[PDB]
Amino acid sequence: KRAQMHFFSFKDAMVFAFAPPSVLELGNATGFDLFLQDQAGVGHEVLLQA
Amino acid sequence: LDTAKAIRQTIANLEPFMPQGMKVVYPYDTTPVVSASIHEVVKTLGEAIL
Amino acid sequence: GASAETVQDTVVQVIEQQMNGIDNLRYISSESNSDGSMTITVTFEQGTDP
Amino acid sequence: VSIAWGSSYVNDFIDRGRVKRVYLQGRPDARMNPDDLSKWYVRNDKGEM
């Protein structure tokens, strides 16, 4: 974070630098994970808005 | 028993996208005989003990 | 020289549709990109022989 | 011979978001009976039919 403020505060380009979880085998990244799907076949627009 | 369960569960999630006038039916399904067999024998078992 | 869309409907979708009848298949995912690359990740249940 | 009767697969096409196939088979009434096939005329080297 002592480098997170440096650029994450840019309209120029996000620069989210982060560290890997406890055990690498699963991740590159801590916190949670999921996928929003398309069962109706609405198409790309809706899911993008969702 | 786990499998038949799981699928019923995968359609339950998919039914709520199906059109106006389609319903899902389960014509063939041997799952029940499995549960009937174990319910019976289990039952006798307990008659055996009494 | 292909667009995400080209790799997704010419390659990434022709594969995904065959990705079945595979044991202990937990979940399948994929990505299609501007550089033309793609990857399908078929993740399995704990205990599968790799 | 193998396009009218034997519905020939030519290529894919997206349908509401899923790749599906494209078959090319002669009309049903043009593969029903033995003489129903005499209908199918081919091309002639010298342009003719």
UniProtKB/Swiss-Prot annotation, chain D:
Induction: By growth under severe iron limitation. The inner membrane transporter component of the MexAB-OprM efflux system that confers multidrug resistance. Functions as the major efflux pump for n-hexane and p-xylene efflux. Has been shown in one study to be involved in the active efflux of the autoinducer N-(3-oxododecanoyl) homoserine lactone, thereby playing an indirect role in quorum-sensing; but has been shown in another study not to be involved in efflux of this autoinducer. Over-expression of the pump increases antibiotic and solvent efflux capacities. Implicated in the secretion of the siderophore pyoverdine. This is Multidrug resistance protein MexB. Pyridopyrimidine derivatives, such as ABI-PP, are not exported by the MexAB-OprM efflux pump, bind tightly to a MexB hydrophobic pocket and so potentiate the activities of antibiotics such as erythromycin. Disruption phenotype: Disruption of MexA, MexB and OprM significantly reduces active efflux of N-(3-oxododecanoyl) homoserine lactone/3-oxo-C12-HSL/PAI-1, but not N-butyryl homoserine lactone/C4-HSL/PAI-2. Component of the MexAB-OprM multidrug efflux complex, composed of six MexA subunits forming a hexameric tube, binding to a MexB trimer, which interact with the trimeric OprM outer membrane channel protein. OprM is thought to not directly contact MexB; instead, MexA joins MexB and OprM by forming a funnel-like hexamer anchored to the inner membrane. MexA may initially form a hexameric ring complex with MexB prior to OprM, then OprM undergoes a conformational change as it contacts MexA, allowing the periplasmic gate to open. It is found in: Cell inner membrane. It comes from the Bacteria. Belongs to the resistance-nodulation-cell division (RND) (TC 2.A.6) family.
